[PDB]
Every structure is written in structure tokens, then in C-alpha cells.
Amino acid sequence: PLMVKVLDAVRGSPAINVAVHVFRKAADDTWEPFASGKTSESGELHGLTTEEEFVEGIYKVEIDTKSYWKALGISPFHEHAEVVFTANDSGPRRYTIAALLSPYSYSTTAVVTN
Amino acid sequence: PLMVKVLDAVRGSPAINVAVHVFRKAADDTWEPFASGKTSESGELHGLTTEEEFVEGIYKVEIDTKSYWKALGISPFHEHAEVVFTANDSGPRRYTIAALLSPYSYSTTAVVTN
Amino acid sequence: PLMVKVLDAVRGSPAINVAVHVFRKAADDTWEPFASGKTSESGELHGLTTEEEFVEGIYKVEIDTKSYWKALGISPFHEHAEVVFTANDSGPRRYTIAALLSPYSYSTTAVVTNP
Amino acid sequence: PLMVKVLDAVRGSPAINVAVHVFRKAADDTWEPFASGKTSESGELHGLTTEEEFVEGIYKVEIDTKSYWKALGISPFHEHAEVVFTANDSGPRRYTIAALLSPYSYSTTAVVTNP
Ligand SMILES: Oc1c(Br)cc(CCc2c(Cl)cccc2Cl)cc1Br
Ligand SMILES: Oc1c(Br)cc(CCc2c(Cl)cccc2Cl)cc1Br
Numbered sequence: 001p002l003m004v005k006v007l008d009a010v011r012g013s014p015a016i017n018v019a020v021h022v023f024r025k026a027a028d029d030t031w032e033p034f035a036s037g038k039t040s041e042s043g044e045l046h047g048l049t050t051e052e053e054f055v056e057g058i059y060k061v062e063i064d065t066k067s068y069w070k071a072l073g074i075s076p077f078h079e080h081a082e083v084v085f086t087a088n089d090s091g092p093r094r095y096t097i098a099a100l101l102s103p104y105s106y107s108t109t110a111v112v113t114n
Numbered sequence: 115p116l117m118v119k120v121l122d123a124v125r126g127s128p129a130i131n132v133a134v135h136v137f138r139k140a141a142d143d144t145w146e147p148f149a150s151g152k153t154s155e156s157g158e159l160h161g162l163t164t165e166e167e168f169v170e171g172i173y174k175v176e177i178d179t180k181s182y183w184k185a186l187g188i189s190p191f192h193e194h195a196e197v198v199f200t201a202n203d204s205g206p207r208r209y210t211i212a213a214l215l216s217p218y219s220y221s222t223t224a225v226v227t228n
Numbered sequence: 229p230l231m232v233k234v235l236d237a238v239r240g241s242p243a244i245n246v247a248v249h250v251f252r253k254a255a256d257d258t259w260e261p262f263a264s265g266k267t268s269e270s271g272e273l274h275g276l277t278t279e280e281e282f283v284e285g286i287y288k289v290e291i292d293t294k295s296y297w298k299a300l301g302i303s304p305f306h307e308h309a310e311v312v313f314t315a316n317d318s319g320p321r322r323y324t325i326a327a328l329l330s331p332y333s334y335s336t337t338a339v340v341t342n343p
Numbered sequence: 344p345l346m347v348k349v350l351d352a353v354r355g356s357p358a359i360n361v362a363v364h365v366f367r368k369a370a371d372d373t374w375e376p377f378a379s380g381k382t383s384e385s386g387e388l389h390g391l392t393t394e395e396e397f398v399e400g401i402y403k404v405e406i407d408t409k410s411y412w413k414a415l416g417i418s419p420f421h422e423h424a425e426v427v428f429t430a431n432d433s434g435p436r437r438y439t440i441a442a443l444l445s446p447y448s449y450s451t452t453a454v455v456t457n458p
Contacts (some may be wrong), residue, residue: 338355
């Protein structure tokens, strides 16, 4: 139900071995860890959660872009990229969070399908 | 060797049934038709060409964004989106041209892999 | 030294009346309020801070995109757009944080200059 | 009535000295030269045309991104960034065409205002 895909706008490639952390907003407004992993050779991260676990709520996907750029020897602007959204059962069942990274910029979209 | 993928930033969905035309630049600097198709339910267009046909050269991928927006009842800015690039045998063998569409904006990247 | 500019990719316009909150990470690792404001008719937000006050640190610029889209009667995907960066770590710089908004997407870039 | 602004997503800066060519589609469907120029130190290009000359039509703004990246010693993917649009079809408007460049990617948006 929740996939992440990360691309590199400098190399023209998937962004490989990027750390990704997902958090769920708790009742006291703190961010509780929920799932995490590293993107694969295709820039994708699957298997974060399951339909049972992924209930409605506010989630934050933190992509560790700074470490990615540093591993390539490139000087970056951002500490990380953030994607904060509400999971909604009224819409389609599968969320893909896609991000496109540059040293001083990032873009993100949601692809929400059944 | 050449895939196109198109996403919709308004609906948060693949951009389905978008017409895509690929042209190759000819010796007299005109654009000759090369391949075309329409994106699938996943927003993807496969099977445009083959490794034998897809020789080095300058190619233009024209995505008919205006008709896409009009079919959804949305008033667009651009006539089409353009992606013009040189195919290079020194780099990886597979090109994916990805585009993310909004009514007054578009973004595109290349994902070039082996 | 810290300005924000926000554009609307649906309308082809500045994104007017967008709330922006800036935080700075404190020594205890919490996010301290730093400055806030709203974009103008030009999509710009000036006057958040001063060179004196804008010291080195890790800053988070939170752009309230959901509130923007909801005020236009649209149900968007994201809660906000966040831009988190270390500022002034090799002396003072001037930063422009630009964002381009759509209901299910946003993009951001920084323009950093040395006065 | 027609301005261009170009930013560099690698440097976090304006994209300076970027060549821009504007064409207009003619009655025979060819692309006629219309105006050209280069971005300044601020990444901006003003003075391309005049309200008199900028009549209704289909315009193509070609941003010479490959030449930019090559001048910086970088081998980029795209030949150029193209922005093709119908202008002034419900009377005069003022257009800003903005682009954000990376070696394998670009994004563009339009800001359209009614004077
Ligand atoms: O499989 C996919 C999926 Br799903 C999504 C994208 C979109 C990447 C993108 C972003 Cl994230 C922001 C601006 C422009 C772009 Cl082209 C690409 C591929 Br290939
Ligand atoms: O005055 C400005 C400033 Br300063 C910045 C931009 C960049 C807008 C943008 C973003 Cl933020 C992300 C992807 C693509 C784009 Cl064209 C435009 C203008 Br006009």
C-alpha cells in the first residue's frame, strides 16, 4: 500500500541506497517511527508496511538526501526531503511517493492507484 | 530501449491515454516521425522502438498535454511538452523519459539504466 | 536574508496568502519557532528575519500548502511542503526558498547568494 | 510582456548567460524567429519584445540548456528546454516563463497576469 521511488536528476539514474524513514503522527503530535528501509538498485523501496498496519492518519516520509549526495561527493543544500500527507481510505488503495533529487532542489509527487 | 512514463500532478495518478510522438532529427534539420503511441492505464508507453532501430542521433519526444487536459475539462497553458535529447551509445542502454504534468507547468527527467 | 516565493502550477499565478512558518533546531534537538508570515499578492514573503537574528543553524521552512488549497476549495495530498537546511555555516548568506505547488505534488529550490 | 527566468538546481543560483530563442508559428505552420536574448546575472531575461509586437499566436521559447551546461564543463542529457504555448488569445497578457535546470532534468512553469 505504500511504495517510495527516488530518482537522481544529476546522474539521470535511480537514487540507490537512499535511507527512507516513515513516521506516523501520534495523538500528542509527536512523530512515531513506523517503517524504514533503503532504496534498491531501481531506486524503489517496497515492503514498508501492510494493508492491516497502514491505517488512516498523518504520515511523514523522510528521505535522507544529504547522506546520498555526500556519498557521491556532491555538496547538498537540504538536510533531508520531507513528504507529509494524510492516508485516506476514501481514495485508491496504493500510494507511491516519488521524489526527484538535485543538490539544491527536490520535487515530489503522489501516484495513488487501485 | 526507450520508454515514456507520464504522471498527473492534479489527480495524483498516472496520465492515461496521452498521445506521445517521437521524432528523429534528419540530416536537413527537419524532424522525421519515428514512433508514437498512447500511454496505458499505468501512464507508461512501451514498445516504441527496438535496439536495432534506435541508433545514436537527436530525438524529440512530444507529449500532447493540451488534449489530455482538455479531456479532463481543465484549461491548460502548453500546446505540448517537449523533450529533446541525444541518444548516446557510451551511456547505459535503456532510456526512460518521465514527465509530471500540471496545467501551467511540467517537469521531466531521464532515467538511463543498464 | 531569508525570503520565500510560492507559485501555483494549476492557475499559473503567484500562490497568494500562503502561510509559512520557520523553525530552528535548538540545542535539545527540538524545533523552536523562529519566524512566520504569509505570501503577498506577488507570491513573495519578505521580512521574516534580520541578519542579526538569522544565525547559523538547521532551519525548517514549513509552507502550509494544505491550508492554501483548502481555501481555494480543493482537497490536496500533502499537509505542507517542508524545506530543511543548514544555514550560514560558512558565514552569512542570503537565501530564497521557492516552491511550485500542485494538488498532489510540489517542487522546491533554493537560491543562495553571498552578499 | 514576455520575460524568462532560469535557475540552476545544482549550484543553487541563477542560471547566468543562458541563451534563449523565441519563435512564433507562421501561417504556413513553420517556426518564424521572433526574439532572442541571454539571461543576466540574476537569471532573468527582459526586453525580448514589446506589447505591439507580441500579438496572438503559438510561441516556442527554446532555452539552450545544453550550451549552458557545456560552458560549465558538464555533459547534460537534453538539447534544450522548450516551452510552447498560445499567447494573448483573450487579449494581452504578461507572461513569465521560469525554468529550473539539472543535468538530466528540467522543470518549467508559467506565471500569467492580466495588466
Ligand atoms: O515510475 C515513476 C514514477 Br511512479 C514517478 C515518476 C515521477 C518523477 C518526477 C518527480 Cl517525482 C518530480 C518531477 C518530475 C518527475 Cl519526472 C517517475 C517514474 Br520513472
Ligand atoms: O522568481 C522566481 C523564483 Br526566485 C524561482 C522560481 C522557480 C520556480 C520553480 C520551482 Cl520552485 C520548482 C520547479 C520549477 C520551477 Cl520553474 C521562479 C520564479 Br518566477
